[PDB]
């Protein structure tokens, strides 16, 4: 009932939107100023990233690189706001992420960092460990 061309178009559009917001936030950080792009769009974007109809296309289109980039340090090396870090981990957790996606994305690297990062809340560190445990299970299960 949604055409495969439409699912693809919307997945691509979401990808490009995550990239534009990332790049605008990073450029603002480099101008000594607040990045508000991600915080203003994370709920709505997270909601859509978790659409079960869209996930397979989003995953196949490398959406994990954008999620990754949103979890990464800004130019001044501060971290994205805690609501973003929490919400995007909650997105990775509910997505049907399998071995193929990890071996291709680098996301497991940023997530792993969160799990052992001493500046991170026990809550987030915990949730990143859970993700790590789950993804170890994907990668290695018979």
Which residues contact a copy of itself by CB under 8 A? Answer: 1-3, 6, 9-10, 13, 44, 47-48, 51-54
Q: CA 13 from chain center: how many Å? A: 16
Nearer to Cl ion, 69 or 80 (CB): 80
Write out the binding residues for Cl ion, residues 19-78 only, by CB under 5 A: 35, 38
Of 132, 103, 40, 29, the closest CA to residue 72 belongs to 29
Judge contact between 50 and 95, C-beta under 8 A: yes
**Nearer residue to a copy of itself within complex by CB, 51 or 115:** 51
Could you say which of 41, 51, 55, 81 contacts Cl ion (CB under 5 A)?
81
| Binding partner at 31 among Cl ion, a copy of itself, none, C-beta below 5 to 8 Å by kind | none
Would you say 1 or 141 has its CB closer to a copy of itself?
Answer: 1
Measure the CA–CA gap between 83 and 106, rounded to whole angstroms.
Answer: 22
Closest CA to 59 of 94, 95, 23, 85: 95
**Other CB atoms within 10 Å distance of the CB of residue 16:** 10
Site membership for Cl ion, residue 80 (CB under 5 A): yes
Dist. CA 107–CA 128, nearest whole Å: 11
Count, residues near Cl ion per rule CB under 5 A: 4
75 neighbors 29 (Cβ within 8 angstroms): yes
CB of 36 to Cl ion, least distance (A): 8
Q: Which residue is nearest to Cl ion (CB)?
A: 80
80 binds, among a copy of itself, Cl ion, none (CB under 5 to 8 A by kind): Cl ion
32 vs 142 by CB, closer to Cl ion: 32
């Amino acid at each position: 009932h949604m055409d495969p061309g439409t699912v693809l178009e919307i997945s691509r559009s979401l990808k490009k939107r995550m990239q534009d917001i990332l790049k605008k936030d990073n450029a603002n950080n480099l101008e000594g100023r607040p990045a508000t792009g991600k915080i203003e769009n994370v709920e709505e974007i997270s909601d859509i990233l978790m659409s079960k109809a869209l996930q397979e296309s989003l995953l196949d289109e490398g959406i994990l690189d954008e999620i990754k980039g949103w979890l990464e340090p800004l130019p001044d090396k501060s971290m994205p706001n805690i609501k973003i870090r929490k919400r995007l981990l909650d997105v990775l957790k509910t997505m049907k992420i399998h071995k193929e996606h990890l071996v291709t994305s680098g996301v497991g690297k940023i997530v792993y960092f969160y799990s052992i990062n001493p500046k991170e809340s026990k809550e987030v560190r915990a949730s990143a460990k859970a993700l790590v445990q789950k993804w170890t299970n994907e990668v290695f299960k018979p």
